[PDB]
Amino acid sequence: DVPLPAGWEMAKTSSGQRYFLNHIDQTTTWQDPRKA
């Protein structure tokens, strides 16, 4: 759960957009949760 948040979602687009969901808040975070 450290290398990838567990209450967390991955939406990786081959177009070059790594945007992630927070399944807890229903919020979309572009920011790496491990950086802060």
Added chain:
Amino acid sequence: STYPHSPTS
């Protein structure tokens, strides 16, 4: 587990 749409599409 779920696919939304890019917030900056």
